[PDB]
Amino acid sequence: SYVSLSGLSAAQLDLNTTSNNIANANTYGFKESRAEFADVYSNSLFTNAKTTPGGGAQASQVAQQFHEGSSIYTNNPMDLRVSGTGFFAVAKERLTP
Amino acid sequence: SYVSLSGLSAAQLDLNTTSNNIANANTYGFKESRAEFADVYSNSLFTNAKTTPGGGAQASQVAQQFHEGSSIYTNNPMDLRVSGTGFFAVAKERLTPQQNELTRNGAFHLNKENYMVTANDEFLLGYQVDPSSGEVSSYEPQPIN
Amino acid sequence: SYVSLSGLSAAQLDLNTTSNNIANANTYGFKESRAEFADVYSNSLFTN
Amino acid sequence: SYVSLSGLSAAQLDLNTTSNNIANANTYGFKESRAEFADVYSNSLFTN
Amino acid sequence: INNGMLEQSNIDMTQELVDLISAQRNFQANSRSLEVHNQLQQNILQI
Amino acid sequence: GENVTLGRVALVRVPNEQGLDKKGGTQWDSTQFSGDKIWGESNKGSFGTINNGMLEQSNIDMTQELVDLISAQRNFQANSRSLEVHNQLQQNILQI
Amino acid sequence: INNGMLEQSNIDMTQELVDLISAQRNFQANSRSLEVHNQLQQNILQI
Amino acid sequence: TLNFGLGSATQFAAPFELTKFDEDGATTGFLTKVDFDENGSVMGTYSNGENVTLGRVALVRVPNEQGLDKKGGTQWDSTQFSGDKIWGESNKGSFGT
Amino acid sequence: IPAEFGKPKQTANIEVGVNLPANGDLKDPTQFDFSDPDTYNRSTSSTIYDSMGQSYKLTTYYLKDQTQPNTWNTYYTVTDKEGEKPLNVAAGDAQTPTGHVGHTMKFNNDGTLASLNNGQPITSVALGDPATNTTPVDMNGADPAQTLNFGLGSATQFAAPFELTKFDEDGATTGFLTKVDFDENGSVMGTYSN
C-alpha cells in the first residue's frame, strides 16, 4: 500500500507538472518542467535483504528544461527577445541594481 | 496452519514485488523484479517420509530482470541512453573515482563547476583522452569536465 | 503553428507592400518598395 | 505506446520541416530541408 | 537580442496531451494496486 | 572554432547482472556474486552504444503486471481459505 | 500581498481519501484485536 | 562617521531627481528556506544571498539495538547490553543517509 | 559459456598505404625522437595482437628527409605498460644516433613510389626477444620471437595532405559473447563479435 501510495503520489506529481505546463501555454518566456523519479531501496544490518522487494517510487526533481521557445512578431521596438543563451536582468527598485 | 501461513507470505511477497514494479512505471532506468519460490521439504531418520506431507513454500530470490526498456526522446544532448549492454558509472564524490555506482538513466546536467552530474549531483565517470589522441589514453575513471 | 503564422505574416507583408506600390501608380516622384525576408533558426545549447 | 509515441513524433517532425519549407517560400537564398528517419531495434543479451 | 519579438512558451501541446494520457493510466494502475491491497487486508479481517 | 574532445563516457559491465546489489535511486553496486566491474568504451566488443537525446523508461508491461496482480490476489485468497479451514478444524476439536 | 486573489484550502482530496481508507483499516484491525480479548476472557469464564 | 560623495550632482532645467544612491551598508540576513543534504548538514539561505551551513544532525548507532531500553514516546536509551552510543555522521562507514 | 571465444592469431603481415605530403616541411634525420612531435611530420596509431591474444598499440612515425629530396624516414614503436619502446628494423637503411632504426622511402617526381628499404623487404626484429632488440616488448608469456612484415608497395607522395588510405592486417584477438540461444536438441549456441 505504501508502495502503491507512492506510485499514486508520483503519478499525481507528474499530472501537476503537466497541468502547469499546459496552463502556461500562452505566457511569454515560460520554460517547461519535467518530473523525474527514482526508485526506493534501503536496508539495515538486521534485515537480510536477499529476498526483500522494493520500496516504491520517490520523486527525484522537477526539472526546468530551458530549450529555446518560439517567437511571435509584434513589430514593436519595445518588445525584445534573447535569441540564444542569456537572460534579461530586472531590478525591483530603480535605485538598487 | 504454518504451511498456509507460508502460502500467505509468498503471495504477499509477490504482491509487494508487483506493486513496486507498478509504482516505478515512470522512473527512468528501472528494471522489473520477478519473485521466485521453492518448495520446502526435510525429513529425519525418525519420520516415515511416505506418510509425511511437505513443508510449505519458501521464497527463493527476488530477481532483477535486466531486459532493455523503452526509450523516450527529449532532443536534449545532456540525456544519454545505453542501447544494449552496459551501465554508466557515477561517483558520489568528485575526487574519489573508486566509490562509484552503476546506473542506467541518463538525466544529466552541468553544475556550477561544469561537471556532468545526475539529479543527486553525483558526478559521472569517464575516460581521459587528449585533444589529439585517438582511443582511451588513460583507462582510469575520473569525472568528466 | 508559429512557423505557419510566420509564413502568413510574411505573405501578408508582401501583400501590403505590393498594394502600396499599386496605389501610388499616379503620384509624382514615388519609388517602389520591395520586401525581403530571411530564415529563422535559433542556435541554443539544447535542441541538438 | 512508446512505439506509437515515436511514430507521432516522427510525423510531427515531418510536419514541422514541411511547414518551415512552406513558410520560406518567398525568402531569397533558401534551401529546403528533408526529414529522414531510421528504425529502432535494441540488441540485448535477453529478449530472445 | 532582437526587437519586435517575444518568446512564447517552449511546450509542445501534443506531447503534453500524450503525457496527460500516460499519467492518467499510471495513476489508474496504482489505484488498482492499492484497491487490491485493501481487499487482501479486508479478506484477512473476516476470519 | 576549436572543436576538441573533452572525454568519453565510461561504460561498466558486470558478468552476472542478476547479482548486483540494489542501492537507492535506481543504482547498483558490484558484489561478490556480481564479479569485477569490466571497464570499457561504448560500441566495443559486447558493449552497447550511447545515444544522446534519449532516456530509458521502465521495462515493465502494465498488462502483465495487472494480470500478475490478479493472480497473486487469487493465491492469497486461496491460502487464507486454507488457514480458515485449519482454524475451524482446531476449534472443532476443542469443543468435545 | 496580491489583490484580486484568495487562498483556498491546502488539502489534497486524493491524499485525504487514501488516509481515510488507511484509518478505517487501522480501526477495523484494532476492533478485531479487542474482540479476541473479549473472546479470551469469555473462554476463561466458562470453566 | 559618514563620508558623502556628490561629485556627479547637476542642476538642469529638469525637476528634482535622485539619479543614483549607492551605499556599503549591510544589515543582516533573513531566514528564507531550509534544506538538508545527504550528509545531514543543514543549509539556510537568507535575503542577502548568504547560504551558510548551520550544523549537521547527529546520528547514533549502537552495536546491539535489540538491547535498547524503551522509554515513552518512541524513544530509547543506551544500556550495557545495548553497548555504547557510537556518534557519527551520516553516509559514513556503517551509517545510513 | 565463455565471455570471449576464439583462437588468437599473432600479427605477421601489416599492409599500409599512405600519401605523404610533398609540401610538408623538411626534417632532420639525425634529430628524430618519438618523444618530440616537432622532429617528425606525422604519426599514426594501430593495434596489433600477440600469440596469446593480447592487444598492443603500434604507433608509426613518418619523417621528411631534408638531405635527400623525395625521401622519407619511417619509424615504428610498440607501446607496453612500461612506456613506448621503439621497434628497430634489422636491415633498415634509416639510422639514428639514438639507436632507433627505421626504413627510407623514395619517390619519383611524378609522385609514384621509387624504392623501399633499398629494395630489401621490411622485416622487424623479434618483439619480445632481448637478445635481438635493445628494447624488448613485454609480451606477458606470449611468443617473444614474433616478427612483423610491413608492406608499403602502394605508398605515394602527392600534393595532397597526409592520408592513411588503406590499413590491412591479419590479426585476430578473440570473440565477445553477444547472444545465447538453445535449439530443440538442447545445444546451447553462442555468437560472438568476430
Q: Is F49 on the interface with I (CB under 8 A)?
A: no
| DSSP for B97-141, written as a single string | SSSEEEE---B-EE-TT--EE-TT-PEEEEEE--SS--S-SEEEE
Alpha-carbon gap, residue I16 to I113, rounded angstroms: 13
Alpha-carbon gap, residue A81 to A62, rounded angstroms: 26
Residue for grid cell 628524430: I32
Structural Rg of chain I based on CA atoms: 20
Q: Counting beta carbons within 10 angstroms of the beta carbon of residue C46, is it exposed (0 to 12), middle (13 to 18) or buried (19 or more)?
A: middle
* D46–chain B nearest CA distance, Å: 6
Taking alpha carbons only, the member of I151, I129, I125, I148 closest to residue I138 is I129
Structural Rg of chain F based on CA atoms: 26
Q: Which of G18, G21, G28 sits opposite E45 (nearest CB)?
A: G28
Query: Order of strands, edge to edge, in the sheet holding I13-19?
Result: I122-123, I149-151, I13-19, I163-169
| Chains in contact with A via at least 3 Cβ–Cβ pairs below 8 Å | B, C, E, F, G, H
The residues, any chain, with a CB within 8 Å of residue I80's CB and separated by 6 or more, are I56, I137, I138
Cβ within 8 Å, pair F78-B7: yes
Residue of C nearest to B78 (CA): C46
Dihedral of alpha carbons F58, F64, F67, F72, sign? negative
Q: Are I29 and I65 in contact (CB under 8 A)?
A: yes
Task: State the CB neighbour count (10 A cutoff) for residue I181.
Answer: 10
Alpha-carbon gap, residue I27 to E20, rounded angstroms: 68
Alpha-carbon gap, residue E45 to G32, rounded angstroms: 7
Q: Residue B72: beta bridge partners?
A: F55
Experimental method: cryo-EM
| DSSP for F22-33, written as a single string | EETTTEEE--TT
Residue for grid cell 531418520: B45
Cβ within 8 Å, pair G25-E34: no
Orientation angle between helical segments A2-23 and G13-44, nearest 10 degrees: 170
**Residue B130 main-chain phi, psi, to 5 deg:** -75, 155
Alpha-carbon gap, residue G10 to F26, rounded angstroms: 32
Segment 149-178 of chain I within 8 Å of chain F by CB: 176-178
Q: Encode E27-45: b = buried (16+ Cβ within 10 Å), e = exposed.
A: bebbbbbbebbbebeeebe
Q: Are H22 and H33 in contact (CB under 8 A)?
A: no
Residue H19: all three cell numbers together: 539619479
* B62–chain D nearest CA distance, Å: 18
Residue F1: all three cell numbers together: 572554432
C-alpha distances in Å from residue H89, one per residue of A46, D1, I139: 20, 46, 49
SS3 at position B64: coil
A-to-B residue pairs, Cβ atoms closer than 8 angstroms:
72
Taking alpha carbons only, the member of H17, F45, A90, F48 closest to residue B85 is F48
* A94–chain F nearest CA distance, Å: 40
Residue of A nearest to G22 (CA): A1
Dihedral of alpha carbons E27, E31, E32, E33, sign? positive
Cβ within 8 Å, pair D47-B68: yes
Residue I118: all three cell numbers together: 633499398
| Chains in contact with C via at least 3 Cβ–Cβ pairs below 8 Å | A, B, D
**Residue B50 main-chain phi, psi, to 5 deg:** -110, 80
Q: Counting beta carbons within 10 angstroms of the beta carbon of residue F35, is it exposed (0 to 12), middle (13 to 18) or buried (19 or more)?
A: middle
SS3 at position H89: coil
Cβ within 8 Å, pair A1-E1: no
Q: Counting beta carbons within 10 angstroms of the beta carbon of residue I132, is it exposed (0 to 12), middle (13 to 18) or buried (19 or more)?
A: middle
